[PDB]
Design a protein around this ligand. Structure first.
Ligand SMILES: CS(=O)(=O)Nc1ccc(C(N)=O)cc1
Length: 164
């Protein structure tokens, strides 16, 4: 079970933690990946989750893309969680540094509603370029299931909690 989380709402929890370390500790049913449409896990949360699976997440993802083609921005797919979780829900939030519509962030969070409980990062935050305060607001206003948010950066975590 999840420990050390600060309760924000009835169903949204938050902790200053490395999502990879959190995944290895809890081994949740679902870990959310901050994915791109091609499932190319190069950097940010995706690169870090993929490196923890010894690249097994990338090999599985390339086979998925070869069969199904790319995901949509705002969409998702369920793949193996490997050594991190039972499953990994690869969710594509809009990448602001690629001109993608920030309005698609609500659609991306709607994917979380298909899972009772999830360990997740803030969608479109970090190298995706969106404001993390805005991502947290869309998360609490869109997700109805139990979401345990891992925020890597302490300074950002403090800013998110203090401004909520
Ligand atoms: C900034 S974030 O959106 O919280 N996502 C990250 C979390 C962890 C790591 C890592 N372990 O390298 C990278 C990015």
């Amino acid at each position: 079970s999840f420990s050390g989380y600060l309760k924000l709402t009835d169903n949204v929890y938050i902790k200053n933690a490395d999502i990879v370390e959190e995944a290895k500790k809890v081994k949740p049913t679902v870990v959310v990946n901050a994915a791109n449409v091609y499932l190319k896990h190069g950097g940010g949360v995706a690169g870090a989750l993929n490196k923890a699976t010894n690249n097994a997440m990338q090999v599985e993802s390339d086979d998925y893309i070869a069969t199904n083609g790319p995901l949509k921005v705002g969409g998702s797919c369920v793949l193996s969680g490997h050594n991190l979780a039972k499953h990994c829900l690869h969710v594509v939030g809009p990448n602001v540094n690629k001109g993608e519509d920030i309005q698609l962030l609500k659609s991306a969070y709607e994917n979380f509603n298909q899972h009772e409980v999830l360990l997740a990062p803030l969608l479109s935050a970090g190298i995706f370029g969106a404001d993390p305060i805005h991502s947290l607001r869309v998360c609490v206003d869109t997700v109805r299931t139990n979401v345990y948010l891992a925020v890597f950066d302490k300074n950002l975590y403090d800013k998110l909690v203090s401004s909520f």
